[PDB]
């Protein structure tokens, strides 16, 4: 989960 | 006086903030326009969402935050995001109008506007008082950017597992903030204490917002107006 957060954290 | 490592931190934080905060507010034209039931929710949800991306940009540039585990970075950002946004918004807050003036008139939000986003005075009354007490401190750029990093790097958040490492980080930042005021802020004899109090105020504001967002997101006709990033960050998923 937290799909976008992982992305935005490189 | 201040050491090279401490002013090295200050340099990083200030630049981090300069990348992630755009004084021209020109990106605002791309949000869903403000309208003035719950007419301001789309513009404001787009507003918050954009701010979350800025805070994540800033966070990644705080020395050490990057080297944290990805769970910890998530946990810090999830619990502290509404607080950092409330902090960074102080840059756009005017004591003349008692409102956030972001360039143009359609990007000027008063209390009444934010009620048209599903929020009550039980939150807006303490928030705008908080913005006023915060503006009266006349913080330096360095002091403002340190407090955002101190607020974000709090180990006493739900979810955090490396409580030691984050308290270490947060500590070194307070040493810098304490030594900066002592040496670079005339009349700052009490400023650090009242900056610490503003943190305690942010916990109350967080709490009140958390309550009022829960009701907002339990009604699909309103949560459908939010953005995926807002729902992820303010979501209770673990
Ligand atoms: C964003 C920001 C700005 C303002 C912040 C505001 C103004 C309106 C009210 C806001 C959005 C709130 C509310 C509404 C929250 C709405 C929702 C997320 C749907 O529950 C809590 C009053 C908290 C911070 C406030 C503009 C600029 O300073 C960048 C900053 O980064």
């Amino acid at each position: 989960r937290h799909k976008i957060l992982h992305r935005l954290l490189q | 006086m201040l050491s090279d490592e401490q002013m090295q931190i200050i340099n990083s934080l200030v630049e981090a903030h300069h990348k992630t905060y755009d004084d021209s507010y020109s990106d605002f034209v791309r949000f869903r326009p403000p309208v003035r039931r719950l007419s301001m929710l789309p513009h404001l949800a787009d507003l918050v969402s954009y701010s979350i991306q800025k805070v994540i940009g800033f966070a990644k540039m705080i020395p050490g935050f990057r080297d944290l585990t990805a769970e910890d970075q998530i946990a810090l950002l999830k619990s502290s995001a509404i607080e950092i946004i409330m902090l960074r918004s102080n840059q756009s807050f005017s004591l003349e109008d008692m409102s956030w003036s972001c360039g143009g008139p359609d990007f000027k939000y008063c209390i009444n506007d934010v009620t048209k986003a599903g929020h009550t005075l039980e939150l807006l009354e303490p928030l705008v008082k908080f913005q006023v007490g915060l503006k009266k401190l006349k913080l330096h750029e360095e002091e403002h950017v340190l407090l955002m990093a101190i607020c974000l790097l709090s180990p006493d958040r739900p979810g955090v597992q490396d409580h030691v490492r984050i308290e270490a980080l947060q500590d070194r930042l307070c040493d810098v903030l304490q030594a900066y005021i002592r040496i670079q802020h005339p009349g700052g004899r009490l400023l650090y204490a009242k900056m610490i109090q503003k943190l305690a105020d942010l916990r109350s504001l967080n709490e009140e917002h958390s309550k009022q967002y829960r009701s907002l997101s339990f009604q699909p006709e309103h949560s459908m107006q939010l953005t995926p990033l807002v729902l992820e960050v303010f979501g209770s998923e673990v």
Side-chain angles (χ1 to χ4, degrees):
Chain A
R1 55 179 75 91
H2 305 118
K3 183 178 56 142
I4 327 176
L5 281 189
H6 282 281
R7 195 51 203 257
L8 299 177
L9 295 190
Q10 280 247 2
Chain B
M1 61 165 287
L2 277 161
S3 61
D4 280 310
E5 185 201 20
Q6 294 170 296
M7 69 97 185
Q8 206 45 56
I9 289 157
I10 301 165
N11 281 341
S12 317
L13 292 190
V14 168
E15 192 190 16
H17 182 52
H18 281 173
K19 294 161 158 48
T20 55
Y21 196 102
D22 179 358
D23 305 301
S24 68
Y25 302 114
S26 40
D27 293 338
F28 282 40
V29 304
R30 288 195 326 262
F31 308 155
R32 293 170 277 170
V35 189
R36 28 216 180 190
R37 200 192 62 262
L38 287 219
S39 47
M40 286 290 295
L41 182 54
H43 179 81
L44 284 190
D46 283 351
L47 179 58
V48 180
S49 180
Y50 173 98
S51 298
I52 297 189
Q53 294 184 62
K54 300 326 243 306
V55 166
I56 294 172
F58 174 79
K60 283 163 79 180
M61 277 176 286
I62 297 170
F65 175 85
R66 203 75 157 89
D67 289 310
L68 288 179
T69 222
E71 287 65 27
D72 271 341
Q73 311 187 25
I74 294 169
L76 294 193
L77 285 153
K78 272 169 74 51
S79 43
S80 68
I82 195 52
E83 296 176 6
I84 312 293
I85 283 161
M86 281 165 159
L87 274 180
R88 72 196 313 277
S89 78
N90 196 246
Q91 195 163 343
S92 88
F93 182 90
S94 173
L95 301 161
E96 322 204 334
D97 303 298
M98 302 286 284
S99 58
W100 293 261
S101 299
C102 301
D106 263 289
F107 310 139
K108 178 169 178 302
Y109 329 102
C110 70
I111 306 150
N112 201 280
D113 298 335
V114 188
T115 67
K116 272 119 70 173
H119 276 302
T120 68
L121 288 169
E122 203 163 327
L123 175 63
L124 300 176
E125 194 175 28
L127 172 54
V128 71
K129 288 194 165 87
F130 168 95
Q131 302 288 334
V132 167
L134 185 50
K135 243 220 147 37
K136 283 166 166 185
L137 298 184
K138 296 237 117 173
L139 294 176
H140 296 182
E141 182 160 50
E142 301 73 352
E143 281 143 1
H144 175 72
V145 84
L146 272 166
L147 188 57
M148 291 185 296
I150 278 137
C151 175
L152 178 41
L153 274 172
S154 318
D156 59 327
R157 306 284 200 185
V160 161
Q161 270 283 350
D162 195 352
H163 203 278
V164 164
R165 174 56 179 179
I166 307 182
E167 203 189 63
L169 264 69
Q170 181 186 247
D171 270 2
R172 186 200 305 150
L173 288 177
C174 294
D175 293 351
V176 180
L177 180 56
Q178 251 189 286
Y180 177 91
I181 298 176
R182 182 212 331 168
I183 300 148
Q184 302 295 140
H185 208 119
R189 178 184 78 246
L190 280 326
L191 176 56
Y192 179 68
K194 43 191 58 173
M195 292 183 76
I196 282 318
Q197 186 47 42
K198 291 298 164 175
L199 289 190
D201 294 332
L202 287 173
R203 295 306 182 100
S204 257
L205 292 192
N206 201 336
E207 203 72 33
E208 180 55 34
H209 172 268
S210 266
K211 261 205 284 181
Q212 293 196 3
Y213 176 94
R214 180 153 23 236
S215 324
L216 190 47
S217 69
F218 282 3
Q219 311 205 355
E221 70 256 50
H222 298 141
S223 69
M224 63 176 284
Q225 311 300 327
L226 309 169
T227 82
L229 181 66
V230 162
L231 293 159
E232 189 176 88
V233 162
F234 299 153
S236 315
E237 234 134 332
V238 137

